[PDB]
Amino acid sequence: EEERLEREHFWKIINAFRYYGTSMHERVNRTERQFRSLPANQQKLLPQFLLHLDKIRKCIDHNQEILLTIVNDCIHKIMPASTFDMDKLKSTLKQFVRDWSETGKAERDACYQPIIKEILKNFPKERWDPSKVNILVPGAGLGRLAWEIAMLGYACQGNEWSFFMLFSSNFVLNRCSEINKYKLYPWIHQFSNNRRSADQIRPIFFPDVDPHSLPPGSNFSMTAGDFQEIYSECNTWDCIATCFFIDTAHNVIDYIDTIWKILKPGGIWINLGPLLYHFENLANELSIELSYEDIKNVVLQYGFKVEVEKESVLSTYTVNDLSMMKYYYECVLFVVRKPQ
Amino acid sequence: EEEERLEREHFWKIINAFRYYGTSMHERVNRTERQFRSLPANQQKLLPQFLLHLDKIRKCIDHNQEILLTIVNDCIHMFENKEYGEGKIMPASTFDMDKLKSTLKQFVRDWSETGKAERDACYQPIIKEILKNFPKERWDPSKVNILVPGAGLGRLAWEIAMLGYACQGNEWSFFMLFSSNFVLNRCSEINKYKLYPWIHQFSNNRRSADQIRPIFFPDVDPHSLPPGSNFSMTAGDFQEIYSECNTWDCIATCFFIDTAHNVIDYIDTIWKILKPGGIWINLGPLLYHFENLANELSIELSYEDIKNVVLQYGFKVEVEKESVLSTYTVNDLSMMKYYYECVLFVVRKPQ
Ligand SMILES: Nc1ncnc2c1ncn2[C@@H]1O[C@H](C[C@@H](N)CC[C@H](N)C(=O)O)[C@@H](O)[C@H]1O
Ligand SMILES: Nc1ncnc2c1ncn2[C@@H]1O[C@H](C[C@@H](N)CC[C@H](N)C(=O)O)[C@@H](O)[C@H]1O
Ligand SMILES: NCCC(=O)N[C@@H](Cc1c[nH]cn1)C(=O)O
Ligand SMILES: NCCC(=O)N[C@@H](Cc1c[nH]cn1)C(=O)O
Ligand SMILES: [Ca+2]
Ligand SMILES: [Ca+2]
């Protein structure tokens, strides 16, 4: 039963990838119908408006071809997908920017470089054979952070639950070599807050780096499924690196429990992120929202020793740099050690 | 005669929403407690202050409800609203509860010392342009007519009136009108009131105390307008109220033109009602309030298109600055913040 319900969920996501163009063409048709409803004197003020909609339509069609390339390369009547899933699909396109485009570099350096520096600090070659250091990256997203860690020689495993992320990371990590071969239009659905009409249809390219350039003897892998269910072996991991991850929990205390169980004595958990609880005030969903002060008190009561704590680490997440409206986070970075 | 009744129906709908705040917020907190109480007992024992913290939030909810009932009491007994009448007790919608939460945050932006930094980024650039174009050496400020559409809680219109200009604020939303009538007419003592504008945010809290911290208002006495000043506020749609052409020396729009169903209609109204030689000062982003909503018209223009439309009307561009950084009802202690790269422009209707 559970295995087939997963197959039902599997096809539900395949269908969403295939419904992208339909969903976006309908949104552009709404904008076009409203423009044509305007008095002719106002339409005449904007002689490029309908042409610009045609450029958006071309970008939609291109994005849809990328999405089909992803869906085809992970297999070997399109029914209307839901609004929840089309939003997750739009976020997935933006994820290619953060994880695999030059455009996403400044974001990666704010989020990933502090984690990588702490791994290098705690697992130096003077003390460890890196190939024997087992590092787990739960909620690895499109896999760039786990990839960076494996590029250093550590045995790194990323884990991911979302098929949106697994289909896409499978494509980038296994069907991509040629730097910047591919092109996406990730901002075409934002019609607000554009300085210039061109900003909305601008492309991004990926991958900025060759994913098949892992060193000889690298140990990189990716698992599919609920982090809290896949990882049952206690005292297994040297290091767990969570990035924008622990606020995805129905109950973050369970995440902390799992991380404690599966770390080796002496192992470390590195965390960087905010506390945007993903199930907060969502209909009929468990969500325990803790302040950072409460999370620290749970961590201390568990027995972790605090080795690093920085608050107010500024970063963005899939930010559109040209947008007239932007979000940023004052993340917390901490490194805690399971006592040996 | 049908507007007379759909407006009345809307008025009591907003009153009822103000009265429903406590019920709504208390339900949210009761959901939090129920979910906490269903965790394993050993996890509950890791947080021995959690239930007491919910109790502090519940006290903040009651205090907020008291402020909202004071606003209600003030506007029900306002002579101007006798046309609205005096038998249903419906629960309010989620949309209106969201508008109530935004309304509490506006008090921070417009009438609290906590909001001073935000005001100085949005309101000072507008005010400097007014002083620049109607300097005291050459203009009797009391004969300069300045319209502030979408005035919200009114702080900007008030600041302009404080300088001596004949300033009128305009606002459509009953949430803003009820609250601004209360602040501008009844809050005559600095920092006498407080409210708890952040208690609804359970995410991105550094310390639990941050969620329940108060803000005080008003930071200035709104009745410290000097003798000779000329300050007023109108109720209703900017496009329907102002139909006389060639009336205003200056129109000042702050975080406003992106509320339009069709921003071209706003631009057209502004051009008609300015005196020849008058100026339109604008500062804000382009967050179109009706974008992608079923059965709502929304024309989303890039800033480039807005400037092109403005130029085609015959406005002359005198000031243009992009990337004017500002926040909007920002929670300074939150771990997640939004900001805007606004455009400031000053355009002149040719004489
Ligand atoms: N229980 C879970 N097990 C595995 N993955 C999860 C789980 N919960 C959430 N996720 C994924 O965690 C990721 C959270 C992302 N915000 C972060 C992605 C990535 N770490 C990044 O910084 O870009 C999402 O991709 C989720 O699909
Ligand atoms: N057609 C309209 N006529 C009058 N007021 C409007 C209209 N459309 C939107 N508003 C109000 O414009 C205001 C927009 C606010 N974002 C800005 C308020 C204020 N200018 C501030 O900067 O704090 C809201 O209070 C709206 O209720
Ligand atoms: N302005 C962009 C903000 C954004 O996309 N946050 C994401 C990712 C996130 C935030 N905390 C943990 N994961 C989301 O909402 O899921
Ligand atoms: N980060 C807080 C954001 C916020 O409240 N923005 C207002 C802003 C706005 C933009 N133009 C007119 N008003 C809204 O969405 O109504
Ligand atoms: Ca109690
Ligand atoms: Ca007084």
- What whole-number distance in Å separates Cα of residue A311 and Cα of residue B316? 48
Q: Reduce the secondary structure of chain A to three states and give it as a string.
A: CHHHHHHHHHHHHHHHHHHHHHHHHHHHHHHHHHHHHCCHHHHCCCCCHHHHHHHHHHHHHHHHHHHHHHHHCCCCCCCCCCHHHHHHHHHHHHHHHHHHCHHHHHHHHHHHHHHHHHHHHHCCCCCCCHHHCEEEEECCCCCHHHHHHHHCCCEEEEEECCHHHHHHHHHHHHCCCCCCCEEECCCCCCCCCECCHHHHCCCEEECCCCCCCCCCCCEEEEEECCHHHHCCCCCCEEEEEEECCHHHCCEHHHHHHHHHHHEEEEEEEEEEECCCCCCCCCCCCCCECCCHHHHHHHHHHHCCEEEEEEEEEEECCCCCCCECEEEEEEEEEEEEECCC
Task: Among A287, A289, A329, select the one facing B336 at the smallest CB separation.
Answer: A329
Interface test with chain A among B261, B320, B336, by most A beta carbons within 10 Å: B336
Rg over alpha carbons for chain B, rounded to the nearest Å, is 22
Contact A275 B312 (CB under 8 A): no
Asked if B178 is an interface residue toward chain A (Cβ–Cβ < 8 A), one would say no
- What whole-number distance in Å separates Cα of residue B66 and Cα of residue B194? 11
- What whole-number distance in Å separates Cα of residue A331 and Cα of residue B108? 24
SS3 B139: coil
Tokens standing for residue B55? 């109790």
Overall resolution, Å = 2.4
Which technique was used to obtain these atomic coordinates? Answer: X-ray
Q: How many angstroms separate the CA of residue B342 from the nearest CA in chain A?
A: 6
β partners of residue A221: A157
Place of tokens 């009345």: B8
- Compute, in angstroms, the gap from residue A42 CA to the centroid of ligand 2: 24
Contact B291 A27 (CB under 8 A): no
Ligand nearest to the CA of A91: 3
Ligand nearest to the CA of A241: 1
The two most distant CA atoms of chain B are separated, in Å, by: 76
Q: Which residues contact A46 (CB under 8 A, 6 or more apart)?
A: A35, B301, B305, B308, B309
Tokens standing for residue B294? 């079923």
SS3 B290: coil
Query: Measured from the CB, is residue B258 less than 6 Å from ligand 4?
Result: yes
Please check whether residue A239 is in contact with residue A136, taking contact to mean a CB–CB distance below 8 angstroms: yes
Q: Reduce the secondary structure of B47-98 to three states and give it as a string.
A: CCCHHHHHHHHHHHHHHHHHHHHHHHHHHHCCHHHHHHCCCCCCCCCHHHHH
By alpha-carbon position, which residue is closest to atom 13 of ligand 4? B255
Nearest partner of A334 among A200, A243, A248, A257, judged by Cα: A243
Helices (H), chain B: 3-37, 41-44, 50-76, 94-111, 116-133, 155-162, 174-186, 208-211, 238-241, 263-273, 303-313
Contact A34 B299 (CB under 8 A): yes
Burial class (CB in 10 A: 0-12, 13-18, 19+), B291: middle
Ligand nearest to the CA of A164: 1
- Compute, in angstroms, the gap from residue A141 CA to the centroid of ligand 1: 6
Work out whether the CA dihedral A225, A230, A236, A239 comes out positive or negative. positive
- Compute, in angstroms, the gap from residue B105 CA to the centroid of ligand 2: 14
A325 contacts on B by Cβ (under 8 Å): 285, 287, 338-341
Query: Measured from the CB, is residue B284 less than 6 Å from ligand 4?
Result: yes
By alpha-carbon position, which residue is closest to atom 11 of ligand 1? A139
- The neighbour count for residue A232, using CB atoms within 10 Å, is 10
- Compute, in angstroms, the gap from residue B223 CA to the centroid of ligand 6: 6
Asked if A191 is an interface residue toward chain B (Cβ–Cβ < 8 A), one would say yes
Nearest partner of A335 among A302, A299, A301, judged by Cα: A299
- What whole-number distance in Å separates Cα of residue B72 and Cα of residue B66? 10
Nearest partner of B253 among B279, B229, B233, B272, judged by Cα: B279
- What whole-number distance in Å separates Cα of residue A28 and Cα of residue A19? 15
Tokens standing for residue B29? 């907190």
- Compute, in angstroms, the gap from residue A138 CA to the centroid of ligand 1: 7
Contact B28 A281 (CB under 8 A): yes
The two most distant CA atoms of chain A are separated, in Å, by: 76
Q: Which residues contact A125 (CB under 8 A, 6 or more apart)?
A: none
Contact A192 B342 (CB under 8 A): no
Structural domains of chain A, ranges and CATH numbers in brackets: 2-337 (3.40.50.150)
| Ligand 1 neighbours (beta carbon < 6 A) | A 98, 138-141, 159-162, 165, 226-228, 243-245, 248
Contact B339 A325 (CB under 8 A): yes
Tokens standing for residue B305? 């298109």
Orientation of helix A144-151 relative to helix A105-122, angle to 10°: 40
- What whole-number distance in Å separates Cα of residue B18 and Cα of residue A74? 53
- What whole-number distance in Å separates Cα of residue A107 and Cα of residue B214? 34
A139 labeled part of a ligand binding site: yes
